[PDB]
Amino acid sequence: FLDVEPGISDRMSATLAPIGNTFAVSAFVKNRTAVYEAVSQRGTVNSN
Amino acid sequence: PTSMKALDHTSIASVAPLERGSVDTDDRNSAPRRGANFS
């Protein structure tokens, strides 16, 4: 048998509720591209 | 154990007081002042 233990789920899910907001994957890629823009400063053909 | 070391070495944004003073008073203890005698 495996016992489900309510409220531990609800402490954990109380924690991850804010987490799931700010770590969404859609927000990483807007972070990356913004880096690749600042970093290059130069024609693409070069640098391989 | 978690290491908080790196986060420990920091500087605070400096600023200059308009009227300088009160500097060496950071740590001192004046021991109490007595009352007058009574009659």
Binding site: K30, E37, A38 | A16
Partner: protein
């Protein structure tokens, strides 16, 4: 009256030297920060 000193610290606050910044990707820079650098750019003997 000096044209650079207004570029250099808008490079810092906006983060972007040579290119436009989108509307979403807008970071946050604390006020005491930009002060720290303006100290080096336009130095003075009066902090006020």
């Amino acid at each position: 009256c000096n044209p650079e000193i207004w570029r250099k610290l808008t490079a810092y606050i906006t983060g972007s030297s040579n290119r436009a910044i989108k509307a979403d990707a807008v970071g946050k820079v604390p006020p005491t920060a930009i002060l720290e650098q303006l100290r080096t750019l336009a130095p003075s003997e009066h902090e006020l």
